[PDB]
Every structure is written in structure tokens, then in C-alpha cells.
Design an enzyme around this catalytic site. Structure first.
Site, PDB file in Angstrom:
ATOM      1  N   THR A 156       0.786  -1.214   0.000  1.00 53.19           N
ATOM      2  CA  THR A 156       0.000   0.000   0.000  1.00 53.19           C
ATOM      3  C   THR A 156       0.842   1.300   0.000  1.00 53.19           C
ATOM      4  OG1 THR A 156      -1.895  -1.135   0.969  1.00 53.19           O
ATOM      5  CG2 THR A 156      -1.781   1.237   1.254  1.00 53.19           C
ATOM      6  N   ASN A 177       5.623  -1.619   3.584  1.00 52.75           N
ATOM      7  CA  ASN A 177       4.612  -1.220   4.618  1.00 52.75           C
ATOM      8  C   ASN A 177       5.248  -1.217   5.982  1.00 52.75           C
ATOM      9  OD1 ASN A 177       2.465  -0.581   3.031  1.00 52.75           O
ATOM     10  ND2 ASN A 177       1.326  -2.503   3.471  1.00 52.75           N
ATOM     11  N   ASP A 684      26.866  -2.562 -13.405  1.00 50.20           N
ATOM     12  CA  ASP A 684      26.167  -1.855 -12.350  1.00 50.20           C
ATOM     13  C   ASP A 684      26.600  -2.437 -11.029  1.00 50.20           C
ATOM     14  OD1 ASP A 684      24.482  -0.076 -11.119  1.00 50.20           O
ATOM     15  OD2 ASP A 684      22.645  -1.249 -11.362  1.00 50.20           O
ATOM     16  N   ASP A 692      27.588   2.366 -14.763  1.00 52.94           N
ATOM     17  CA  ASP A 692      28.778   2.644 -13.961  1.00 52.94           C
ATOM     18  C   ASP A 692      29.790   3.408 -14.784  1.00 52.94           C
ATOM     19  OD1 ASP A 692      27.675   1.025 -11.918  1.00 52.94           O
ATOM     20  OD2 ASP A 692      29.233  -0.522 -12.117  1.00 52.94           O
TER      21      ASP A 692
HETATM   22 CA   LIG Z   1      25.666   1.877 -11.370  1.00 52.08          CA
HETATM   23 CL   LIG Z   2       6.707  -4.588   3.686  1.00 53.23          CL
HETATM   24 ZN   LIG Z   3      -3.755  -4.606   2.046  1.00 52.10          ZN
END
Ligand SMILES: [Ca+2]
Ligand SMILES: [Cl-]
Ligand SMILES: [Zn+2]
Ligand SMILES: *[C@@H]1O[C@H](CO)[C@@H](O[C@@H]2O[C@H](CO)[C@@H](O[C@@H]3O[C@H](CO[C@H]4O[C@H](CO[C@H]5O[C@H](CO)[C@@H](O)[C@H](O)[C@@H]5O)[C@@H](O)[C@H](O[C@H]5O[C@H](CO)[C@@H](O)[C@H](O)[C@@H]5O[C@H]5O[C@H](CO)[C@@H](O)[C@H](O)[C@@H]5O)[C@@H]4O)[C@@H](O)[C@H](O[C@H]4O[C@H](CO)[C@@H](O)[C@H](O)[C@@H]4O[C@H]4O[C@H](CO)[C@@H](O)[C@H](O)[C@@H]4O)[C@@H]3O)[C@H](O)[C@H]2NC(C)=O)[C@H](O)[C@H]1NC(C)=O
Ligand SMILES: CC(=O)N1CCC(c2ccc3ncn(CC(=O)N(C)Cc4ccc(C#N)c(Cl)c4)c(=O)c3c2)CC1
Ligand SMILES: [K+]
Ligand code: NA
EC number: 3.1.4.39
Length: 806
Positions: A156, A177, A684, A692
Site C-alpha cells: 500500500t 509497509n 552496475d 557505472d
Molecule cells: Ca551503477
Molecule cells: Cl513490507
Molecule cells: Zn492490504
């Protein structure tokens, strides 16, 4: 403590101590003035006019008003005009195109109202259609997608704050969350005061973007105890403020259907009512707008944060079934897992032993462990100190927990949840909704599915704002809008390529390479030179050369079968482009050529790789970007063994790459009527999703300056209308891409001891990617030369092939 809300109900500016508050958040802080309920949360007589109330004498104690002065006061019940004035409900009116904003005098721009629904799974649009007539009207008369892809984790708070900022959770900081920040030594939870501290929330949400640019907007947050009818009347009252005081952006939030979904599962019989109730709320808002003559003026966005899946207590994997030392870890549990040491700064805790203990231990294991840097790059879920190094991706429909006692609570554990969300953002059940309705949106228009990170840019366009820097691709959703304020243009090329000719004699190289190539005229001699100078280039580079968007030194190298952009800094191609028609033949690497590597006379010894380094490095082998298996002729095959087509590959990875090149490319060419392939390395090492610089590289081929890629990409393009071959396509394009981790083992694939045909393509699918992800990781820009509009190309670059069914 002290003061009154008289004349201050739902005030837009929040006041500081000692003074008490009257704004839509004071309840969450326990800081409302003592008279807030009495004055601001009136309930008497409910939320609807009835016929006996019409024309009543105003009674200020009522929840809303049916008195004659109510429109001018801005506080009628939303159905006032229906009951008291013969008017029709908004939902009963025919869809009529809104060609131009039709707004009252003093409205400087169409307001934007964002209606957010928690847990509103994409398939509710079809499956609950019979009970959602207001929502179905918005959807069919406005602009809608079949679904919208949330960010990972499909929770959420990460998704709502992504909606507000256009940023991945790794960048905005709300990475779950719940989360623990090791620098704060503090934990953020849905419930509690800690989440109120601004230190957790980064980026620039729309309300701050709006305010900095002189467009009025408060936060999108709401105290849970304020009922939905009161949120709606509050937005409607705000809309009646004086021009100089009235916000231009509004947000309504619903805790449903997510609240019921968790209890009953996504399609429990109990879910019909929560959908009816949300629809009724939408009708209140639309009726309210119609009364204020704003229903053909405001832009409305009906958007969810994530979907909902069937998940029950008995589908829980326990880590205590895998580890003996389970008391040494802390787990963030549920539909994802995150593991860190129980005791901070402890020396004898080993992430590697923990991963090993969690890998491929049970045949049908319902999670897979990852070091966060190895998670699929499409999730963008690593670059934040609140994301634990160890991550468990949990199968849809499952949970992970640390010990049985965490789940089965005393007396002896009964369940009482049947739904949950948080899984991989490609999972069908996690998809959510988008509808845009209003003068600025298109009329009765379907658009393809897109990612929630794109909406912030569009909301800024809706409001005439310049967006803060974010992860959307501005212009990729221009096709949602009737009138666009943003004209995207291609980034400027920063480095121009060199085009070297033959410059070095064979005996100038001392690369420790050998090849059996002296084998074998005047007819196929000018033809050889023509190819090296770019004659087949229109065949193999179908969309122009990629632009290099940073300062570097590189060469364009042409060949019969492929073209490449060769970096003199990284000693390998940044990109290699080639087209394989439906009719192309696969051949083998001839026996006498097995270990063949050839110096490239266009490229100096000093800017070449060398075979000796590969011989000396007992972990590291090599592969080729253009595959020898796909050479157009035994003679052209020699070009595929140039030192300038070679790249470092772990033997474990060579299994994957060779299967892709030998088997899969030709299969895709057969299925798609030819494909164009661009392949290359990605570096990376700091897992920030960005190219990079050379001083960030942590691994080289032993005793050389040859850098080791972290990943290998390919972009595979063909004609959307597959009756046309990839190389002669007149219309829109179709693309799939991947970014494969360059790993020294295949521990991620539990079936890897079997034949490649049983596990390679599954791995590739898991690591599917957008063109735009590869762009960030390479500093390249693709599709520079096509016959397609740039907006359309921006949509194509944001596409993700997910491999989910329907
Ligand atoms: Ca990078
Ligand atoms: Cl979470
Ligand atoms: Zn939920
Ligand atoms: C998705 O999009 C986002 C946004 O476009 C991309 O993320 C951006 O990426 C940029 C490049 O990596 C990065 O640039 C940094 O910025 C450093 C300044 O950092 C702070 O200030 C930022 C700007 O704030 C203002 O503007 C915003 C509007 O957008 C307002 O709302 C603000 O209120 C301000 O007015 C700020 O956004 C940033 O936020 C991060 O940190 C916050 C505070 O803790 C968090 O709350 C927040 O969530 C952000 O956290 C994320 O980003 C950080 C890294 O910034 C990361 O560690 C976290 O894990 C998390 O992911 C800060 O408050 C600036 O110092 C950098 O410059 C240094 O490095 C470069 C080379 O890399 C050098 O050129 C430069 O000289 C300098 O190096 C020198 O100094 C160092 C010592 O101090 C040292 O290393 C070195 O030796 C040198 O001496 C650089 O410009 C952006 O900050 C970042 N923005 C955000 C929001 O994340 C992202 O890349 C995109 N993703 C993909 C895949 O494309
Ligand atoms: C950053 C900032 O300004 N802060 C920090 C947080 C603070 C704060 C104070 C009181 C609160 N009361 C209730 N809720 C629950 C709630 O509103 N939602 C479930 C709906 C929702 C709506 C939009 C977005 C978004 N985006 C998100 Cl994440 C959630 C809060 O989250 C909340 C947060 C306000 C000031
Ligand atoms: K080797
Ligand atoms: Na394996």
C-alpha cells in the site's frame, strides 16, 4: 491541548503547537481541538436529502443540507438536486464528449481529483461491472487501461507514494509497509507515530510540486475515522472556496476494497458489498460535481495501488524448516521476505551461509532467496539502505514466516485472513486499475497497460506543472491526453563515433590468440570491402545507431552479419546489432574454429582484449555478442571470432548465453517473422540501476584491464504486424528485452542440472526488461531513426513483456 475549530473545519493550512488543529489529519495525531467532532464531524440526519427535507429551514447541526441556501453555501447533500429539484443522477446521463473544459467563472485551470482505491484488483472492472455503474460509466466514457502495473513490493504505502512522486520505492524511501532504517535505528509501521516523521519520505510528491509552482494543493493523506461521505463533502466544500483560496488538486482515498479483501479473499461473496459502496461514493462525488457545475470541468483519476491474491495461513513456508540457527535472524515476513542479522554489528553472521541454506532445498519450495543486487533489474529494488541484503521472492498465493509461532497464535491458531498482496509486480492478481475522465483526457479511449511510475508526469501535465526529476518517461503517456502540454524530444548524442579503417598489421598484435584462418579470387573481394564499409548496415541496424549519451571514446565496426559500437575504454562493444530473418539457418562452430580468436586490424593492440588473460583467469571464460551460429556464410563466420566481438563470460553463464544464441534467437525469428537483436554488456556494481563509470568497476579479468559485466542485455524487435518481416516493416514495432545477471553459478535456477531446454528460457522470462531499463544501465538511447512518432517510441521503450497469461 487548547483552542476551537469554530470557522476552521478542515482548514487547509496545518497549525503548529501549542495551538490545536482542525485539518483532515488532526485525528491521526490526536491533536484536534476539543470541539472538532461537534463542529467538523456532524452526522445528524445522515448524508441524503429526502423529500420532506426539501426547502427546510437551515439547521447547522445537520450533516449536510437540503435548505434553499445550500448551493451558495456549498454544503448541500450530494443528492439534493436529484431529490429536491427534479435533476438526474450523473450516472443516468448519457456519455457526452467533453471537447473543452466547461468551468464556472474564476476557474483558472481544470481541477484534478485523484480517487484512490486500496486493493482494487484490475479484474474487478469486468467481474464486478454489474454492481459498479458509476465506475463503469467513468471507465467507458473516459480513457482507461485494461490494467495498470504497480511497483514492487505490491504493498500500500510504497505504491501510493510512488503514485505521488513518479519514483521507485528505492528512490522515494518507502520501500515496504514496514521497514527498519539502520541509520535511524527505527522502524516504520502502518500503525503508529513513527511514519509521521518526514525523514522517511523522500522525493517530491505532487502536492509539493504543485505548491512550489503556485498551484494550491494539500497532502493526499486522510485520517481513517473520517467517514467517506464526510471526505466527499469536504472536497466539495473546498471546491466552493474563493478563487484565491481554492485548491486545484484534490485526493480522496478509500481503505476498501483492500480491507474486506484481506478478510474474504479477492472474490469472496463478501466482496460484492464493498464494491457497491465504493461505486456509491463515486456517484456522490459525481453528483456533487454536477451540482456545482464542475462535472464537465474537473479531471478525475480513478486509480488503485495494487490488487489482491488468495493467501491463507496454511500456505506458509517457515524458515525454521530450513535454518538451524533461526534465532540469529530478523525477518520481515509475508508476501515477500527480507532478512538481516538479529544482532546489529555482529561479526559471525554469514549472509552466504543463510542463502545457501535457503536455496533449492525442497522440490516445491514456495520462495526463492536472492542477494538484493541479484534480484531482477525490472523490480528496481536494491538501492536503499532500508532494503535488507537478503531478499526472498515469495510465490503467489504463499507467505513466508520465521517460526510457526509467528503465524499460529494462542489458544491454537485459527486463520481469519484469506487475501494478501505484496508479490512480484508482474503477477496478474497484483495488477490494479486506471481510469481518467475529464476535458483533458480522451473520450471513450482504451490505452495499453502501463506502470504507475508514469502517472506523476501526466498529473503535472494536467496541472501545468513542470515535474520534479522522476522515473517516468515523460511523453510515454501522451496518448492518454486530448491536449498535451509536453512535447518530448530525443536526448542529444554526447559522443560521436570513430569509423576506423584498416590500420594495423597482424604482427603488431601480441594477444596470445590463435585461429585456424589462413584457409583459402577477385569477385568476392570488393564485396568483402563493401561489407566492412557498411553496405549491409541497413539490414542489421534497422532503427539507426544507438546514441551514446555520455563522454567516451568508441568505434563503429561494420561486418557482413552485424554492426557494433566498440568502446576503447571498456575494450568491448557497448552494443552489437544484427537482424535474423525467418528463413535464416543455424550452423555450428566448425571443429577447427573452436578456440579461434582473431585480432581486428581496425583496432589497436592497446585497445583490444587478449587471450592470455582468459587463459590465466581460471574462473572466467569468454563468449561472443554476435553469435557464430548465425553467420550467413562459412566465410562471414570468421568475422564472429574477432577479438572485438568477445566479452568475458563465466562458464556457468556461457550455458545460458549459448542456448539463447543457438536456439532461442532462431525460434523468435521463426515466431515473429524475423527479429532484430541488439545485445551488449551492463556494468552496475553499485546496483543503482545506472551505468557505472569506469572507476566504479570492482572486477576485471585476472591481470588485465578487461572489466567484467554484471549483466548482459538483449533487445529483440520485430514488426507488430508479423505478416511483415522485421526488416521490411511499415508500421508499429513489437519488442521484448531482457537483462540477464552475469553470475558464476546457476543457483537461481533449481533445474539447472537438466538440459538448457528445461530452464534457460524460464530464467530469461524472469529477467524480462523494458528498453528504458537498459537505457539507464548503458547510457544509450535506442530507436533514433524510425518512421514512428517519438511519443509512440517512448511507449515502446516503456513496454515490458511479462509472460503472464490473461
Ligand atoms: Ca551503477
Ligand atoms: Cl513490507
Ligand atoms: Zn492490504
Ligand atoms: C529514478 O529517478 C530519481 C530522481 O531523478 C533518480 O535518483 C537521483 O539520482 C541522482 C544520481 O544518482 C541523484 O543525484 C545525487 O544527488 C545528491 C544530492 O542528494 C540529495 O538531494 C537531492 C535533491 O534534493 C532536492 O530536490 C528534490 C526534488 O527532486 C526536493 O524534493 C528536495 O527536497 C531538494 O530540494 C535529493 O533528492 C536526495 O534524496 C535522496 O536522499 C534523501 C535524504 O536522505 C532521501 O530522503 C531520498 O529518498 C533520496 O534517497 C535516494 O537517493 C540517494 C542518493 O541521492 C540514495 O543513497 C538512497 O538510497 C535513495 O535511493 C538527497 O537528499 C548529490 O550529492 C550527488 O552528487 C554526488 O555524486 C555525483 C556522482 O554520483 C558527483 O557528480 C557529485 O559531485 C557528488 O559527489 C561528491 O560528493 C560526495 C560526498 O558528499 C562523494 O560521493 C564524492 O566523493 C564527491 O565528493 C548526485 O547528484 C539524486 O539524488 C537522485 N534523486 C532521488 C530522489 O533519488 C534515480 O536514479 C532514477 N532511477 C533510475 C533507475 O533511473
Ligand atoms: C510525507 C508527509 O507529508 N507526511 C508524513 C506522513 C504524515 C501522516 C500523518 C497522518 C496520517 N494519517 C493517516 N494515514 C493513512 C493514509 O492517509 N492512507 C492509508 C492513505 C494515503 C494517502 C496518500 C498517500 C500518499 N502519497 C499514502 Cl502513502 C497513504 C497516513 O498515512 C498519515 C501520514 C503526513 C505528513
Ligand atoms: K579462463
Ligand atoms: Na541450479
Amino acid at each position: 491541548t487548547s483552542g476551537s475549530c469554530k470557522g476552521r473545519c478542515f482548514e487547509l493550512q496545518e497549525v503548529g503547537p501549542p495551538d490545536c488543529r482542525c485539518d483532515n489529519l488532526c485525528k491521526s495525531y490526536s491533536s484536534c481541538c476539543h470541539d472538532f467532532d461537534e463542529l467538523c464531524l456532524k452526522t445528524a440526519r445522515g448524508w441524503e436529502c429526502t423529500k420532506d427535507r426539501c426547502g427546510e429551514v437551515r439547521n447547522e447541526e445537520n450533516a449536510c443540507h437540503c435548505s434553499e441556501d445550500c448551493l451558495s453555501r456549498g454544503d448541500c447533500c450530494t443528492n439534493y438536486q436529484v431529490v429536491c429539484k427534479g435533476e438526474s443522477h450523473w450516472v443516468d446521463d448519457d456519455c457526452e464528449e467533453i471537447k473543452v473544459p466547461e468551468c464556472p467563472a474564476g476557474f483558472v485551470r481544470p481541477p484534478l481529483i485523484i480517487f484512490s482505491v486500496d486493493g482494487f484488483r484490475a479484474s474487478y472492472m469486468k467481474k464486478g461491472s454489474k454492481v459498479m455503474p458509476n465506475i463503469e460509466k467513468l471507465r467507458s466514457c473516459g480513457t482507461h487501461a485494461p490494467y495498470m502495473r504497480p511497483v514492487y513490493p505490491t504493498k500500500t504505502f510504497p505504491n501510493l507514494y510512488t503514485l505521488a512522486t513518479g519514483l521507485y520505492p528505492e528512490s522515494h524511501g518507502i520501500v515496504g509497509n514496514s521497514m527498519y532504517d539502520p541509520v535511524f535505528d527505527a522502524s516504520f509501521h502502518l500503525r503508529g507515530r513513527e511514519k509521521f516523521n518526514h525523514r522517511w519520505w523522500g522525493g517530491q510528491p505532487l502536492w509539493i510540486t504543485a505548491t512550489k509552482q503556485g498551484v494550491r494543493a494539500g497532502t493526499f493523506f486522510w485520517s481513517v475515522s473520517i467517514p467517506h461521505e464526510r471526505r466527499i463533502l469536504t472536497i466539495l466544500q473546498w471546491l466552493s472556496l474563493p478563487d484565491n483560496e481554492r485548491p486545484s488538486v484534490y485526493a480522496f482515498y478509500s481503505e476498501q476494497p483492500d480491507f474486506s479483501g484481506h478478510k474474504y479473499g479477492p472474490f469472496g461473496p463478501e466482496m460484492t458489498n464493498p464494491l457497491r459502496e465504493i461505486d456509491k461514493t463515486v456517484g456522490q462525488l459525481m453528483d456533487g460535481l454536477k451540482q456545482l457545475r464542475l462535472h464537465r470541468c474537473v479531471n478525475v483519476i480513478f486509480v488503485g495501488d495494487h490488487g489482491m491474491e488468495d493467501v491463507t495461513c496454511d500456505r506458509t513456508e517457515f524458515l525454521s524448516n530450513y535454518l538451524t540457527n533461526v534465532d540469529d535472524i530478523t525477518l520481515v515476513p509475508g508476501t515477500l521476505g527480507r532478512i538481516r542479522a538479529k544482532s546489529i554489528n555482529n561479526s559471525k553472521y554469514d549472509p552466504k551461509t543463510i542463502i545457501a541454506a535457503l536455496t533449492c532445498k525442497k522440490p516445491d519450495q514456495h520462495f526463492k532467496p536472492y542477494m538484493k543486487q541479484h534480484l531482477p533489474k525490472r523490480l528496481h529494488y536494491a538501492n536503499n539502505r532500508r532494503i535488507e541484503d537478503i531478499h526472498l521472492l515469495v510465490d503467489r498465493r504463499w507467505h513466508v514466516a520465521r517460526k510457526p509461532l509467528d503465524v499460529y497464535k494462542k489458544p491454537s491458531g485459527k486463520c481469519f485472513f484469506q487475501g494478501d498482496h505484496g508479490f512480484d509486480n508482474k503477477v496478474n492478481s497484483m495488477q490494479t486499475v486506471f481510469v481518467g475522465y475529464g476535458p483533458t483526457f480522451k473520450y471513450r479511449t482504451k490505452v495499453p497497460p502501463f506502470e504507475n511510475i508514469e502517472l506523476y508526469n501526466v498529473m503535472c501535465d494536467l496541472l501545468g506543472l513542470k515535474p520534479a526529476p522522476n522515473n517516468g518517461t515523460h511523453g510515454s503517456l501522451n496518448h492518454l491526453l486530448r491536449t498535451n502540454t509536453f512535447r518530448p524530444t530525443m536526448p542529444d548524442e554526447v559522443s560521436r563515433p570513430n569509423y576506423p579503417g584498416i590500420m594495423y598489421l597482424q604482427s603488431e598484435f601480441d594477444l596470445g590468440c590463435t585461429c585456424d584462418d589462413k584457409v583459402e579470387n577477385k569477385l568476392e573481394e570488393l564485396n568483402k570491402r563493401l561489407h566492412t564499409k557498411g553496405s549491409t548496415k541497413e539490414r542489421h541496424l534497422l532503427y539507426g545507431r544507438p546514441a551514446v549519451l555520455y563522454r567516451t571514446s568508441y568505434d563503429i565496426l561494420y561486418h557482413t552479419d552485424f554492426e557494433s559500437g566498440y568502446s576503447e575504454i571498456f575494450l568491448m562493444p557497448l552494443w552489437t546489432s544484427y537482424t535474423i530473418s525467418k528463413q535464416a539457418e543455424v550452423s555450428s562452430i566448425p571443429e577447427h574454429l573452436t578456440n579461434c580468436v582473431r585480432p581486428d586490424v581496425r583496432v589497436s593492440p592497446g585497445f583490444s582484449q587478449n587471450c592470455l588473460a582468459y587463459k590465466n583467469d581460471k574462473q572466467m571464460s569468454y563468449g561472443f555478442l554476435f553469435p557464430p551460429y548465425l553467420s550467413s556464410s562459412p566465410e562471414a563466420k570468421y568475422d564472429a571470432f574477432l577479438v572485438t566481438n568477445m566479452v568475458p563470460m563465466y562458464p556457468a553463464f556461457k550455458r545460458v548465453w549459448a542456448y539463447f544464441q543457438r536456439v532461442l534467437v532462431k525460434k523468435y525469428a521463426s515466431e515473429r517473422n524475423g527479429v532484430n537483436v541488439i545485445s551488449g554488456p551492463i556494468f552496475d556494481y553499485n546496483y543503482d540501476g545506472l551505468r557505472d563509470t569506469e572507476d566504479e568497476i570492482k572486477q576485471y579479468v585476472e591481470g588485465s584491464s578487461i572489466p567484467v559485466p554484471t549483466h548482459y542485455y538483449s533487445i529483440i524487435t520485430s514488426c507488430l504486424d508479423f505478416t511483415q518481416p522485421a526488416d521490411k516493416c511499415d508500421g508499429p514495432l513489437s519488442v521484448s528485452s531482457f537483462i540477464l545477471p552475469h553470475r558464476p553459478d546457476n543457483d537461481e535456477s533449481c533445474n539447472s542440472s537438466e538440459d538448457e531446454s528445461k530452464w534457460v528460457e524460464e530464467l530469461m522470462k524472469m529477467h524480462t526488461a523494458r528498453v528504458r531499463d537498459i537505457e539507464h544501465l548503458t547510457g544509450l538511447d535506442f530507436y533514433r531513426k524510425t518512421s514512428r512518432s517519438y511519443s509512440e517510441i517512448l511507449t515502446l521503450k516503456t513496454y515490458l513483456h511479462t509472460y503472464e497469461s490473461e
